[PDB]
Amino acid sequence: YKTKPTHGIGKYKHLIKAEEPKKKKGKVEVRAINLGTDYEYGVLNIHLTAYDMTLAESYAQYVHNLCNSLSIKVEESYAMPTKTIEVLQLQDQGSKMLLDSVLTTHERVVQISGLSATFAEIFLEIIQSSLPEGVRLSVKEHTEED
């Protein structure tokens, strides 16, 4: 009841903040909160690309579990479409004929939100030390449309 000592004992929506907003076409990015004594970066991108698919998938799983274990939030994880590259082989003796062979390229993306600068440098070095064989890392910014 409203006058009893147990008023508001069944309150729950002051615990769940999720307003269920349109989280598909919204572009309300969080900005870099920088106080000098309190630097905190926003919604930086992480790119992992390779010609091998399963290595990129495995390292994306690794970095996802790593940032999940260190309590820094994952915004979204998704992938770009693949690119395919031809090695148009010039013939050895008569170099006017151009034979061809096939090769591929994949890409994976994770996003991180909370980064103090000390944890930023320790985070990027600890990813960079455990960087697997064959991929390239690139910490880019947020305005990356497909």
């Binding site: 004594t37 260190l70 890392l137």
Partner: protein, 99 residues
């Protein structure tokens, strides 16, 4: 507009009679289970080493930040804030053979 490439092609349906055969024995399955047990313990060991290094490095950095805050009232304001040198940060992976 997103372009998806997790679609398997429509050619992947028909020729589906090449390797359905799996005929194994008991020694191979016990070998594979024992190897998965060994690899589980090994990966737990690696993750423990990784966590201990991360925690020791973090307490080292925090000890440094505390001593800088004690000894100098102005250098922490520039020392904490992240300079824009590392905006397009990247690093290419290792190799197998040297040049």
């Amino acid at each position: 507009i997103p372009i998806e490439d997790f679609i398997t092609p429509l050619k992947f349906l028909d020729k589906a009679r090449e390797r359905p055969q799996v005929e194994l024995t008991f020694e191979e399955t016990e070998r594979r289970a024992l190897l998965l047990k060994k690899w589980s313990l090994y990966k737990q060991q690696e993750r423990k080493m990784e966590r201990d290094t991360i925690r020791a490095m973090l307490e080292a950095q925090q000890e440094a930040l505390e001593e800088l805050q004690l000894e100098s009232p102005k250098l922490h304001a520039e020392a904490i804030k992240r300079d824009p040198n590392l905006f397009p940060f990247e690093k290419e992976g290792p190799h197998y053979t040297p040049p």
